[PDB]
């Protein structure tokens, strides 16, 4: 089935998921000289004070940190959004080397990794309904560069040994996602898709301009994870990123000058 290899990677996905070649696929290259400032865009409201993490799972493609989304505890609003979007999970994409790993690119620059905080529009009642709608999800994307350690990431890094292989999960309570955010909330926004199958065109992307810094040791621990299940041939979980897709008939808007 689908993955990130020669035989089942991004270049193959369109045979199972023909929407791969659609009009609003993600990620994209952000060309900072053609993104237009939109003074009508509001500041982003990220309200994570009551966020309730539950569990961390190796799904064979990444690891997901999952949240209780059964009430309005952690929500994204404002910016380009109408209405309220509830946090359900976050995950990352990363490289085998520090020079690649991000999904979005900025003027063709690849970062070492990219964090995705996934939120669903409460007017659709649940996640599965929301992904069927063009405004169903809002994904906050944050780039990671290698430099100083990110203290707020360490709790994640130190549980990874317990979820090494596909299908493994661990309790992951009381994790505060505010510690993964950069200082500035300046962003770019555009309409797009999920970046993994089923590649549904349901996402308002909100990509922050300012990266976070993580240390080489932190990223090294991500690269020890496995795509495989326990007692299968080891295949390191690296390069779990989809390359940039054609922008087509879209505009990328900036919240800042
Ligand atoms: Zn993602």
Swiss-Prot record:
Effect of residue 118 to A/G/I/L/S: Reduced CO(2) hydrase and p-nitrophenyl acetate esterase activities
Stated consequence of mutating residue 196 to H: Higher affinity for bicarbonate. Enhanced proton transfer capacity
Entry-annotated residues carrying Phosphoserine: 162, 169
One Gene Ontology term of the molecular function aspect: arylesterase activity
Outcome following mutation: residue 59 to L: Reduced activity
Impact reported for residue 139 to H: Impaired activity
pH-activity relationship: Optimum pH is 6-8.
Annotated site residues (Fine-tunes the proton-transfer properties of H-64) in this chain: 4, 59, 64
Keyword Lyase set for record: yes
Active site: 61
Effect upon mutating residue 103 to A/Q: Strongly reduced CO(2) hydrase activity
UniProt record similarity statement: Belongs to the alpha-carbonic anhydrase family.
Protein's UniProt name: Carbonic anhydrase 2
Gene: CA2
């Amino acid at each position: 089935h689908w993955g990130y290899g020669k035989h089942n990677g991004p270049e193959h996905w369109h045979k199972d998921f023909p929407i791969a070649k659609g009009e609003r696929q993600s990620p994209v290259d952000i060309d900072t000289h053609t993104a237009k400032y939109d003074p009508s865009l509001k500041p982003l409201s990220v309200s994570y004070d009551q966020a309730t993490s539950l569990r961390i799972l190796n799904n064979g493609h990444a690891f997901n940190v999952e949240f209780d989304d059964s009430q309005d505890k952690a929500v994204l609003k404002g910016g380009p959004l109408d209405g309220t979007y509830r946090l359900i999970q976050f995950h990352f994409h990363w490289g085998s080397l520090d020079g690649q790993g991000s999904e979005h690119t900025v003027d063709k620059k690849k970062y070492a990794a990219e964090l995705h905080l996934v939120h669903w529009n409460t007017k659709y009642g649940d996640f599965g309904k929301a992904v069927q709608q063009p405004d169903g999800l809002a994904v906050l994307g944050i780039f990671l560069k290698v430099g100083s350690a990110k203290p707020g990431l360490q709790k994640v890094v130190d549980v990874l040994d317990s979820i090494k292989t596909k299908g493994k999960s661990a309790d992951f309570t009381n994790f505060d996602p505010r510690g993964l955010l950069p200082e500035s909330l300046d962003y770019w926004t555009y309409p797009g898709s999920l970046t993994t199958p089923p590649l549904l065109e349901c996402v308002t992307w909100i990509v922050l301009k300012e990266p976070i810094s993580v240390s080489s040791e932190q990223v090294l621990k991500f690269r020890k994870l496995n795509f495989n299940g326990e007692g299968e041939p080891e295949e390191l979980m690296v390069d779990n990123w989809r390359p940039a897709q054609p922008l087509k008939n879209r505009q990328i808007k900036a919240s800042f000058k």
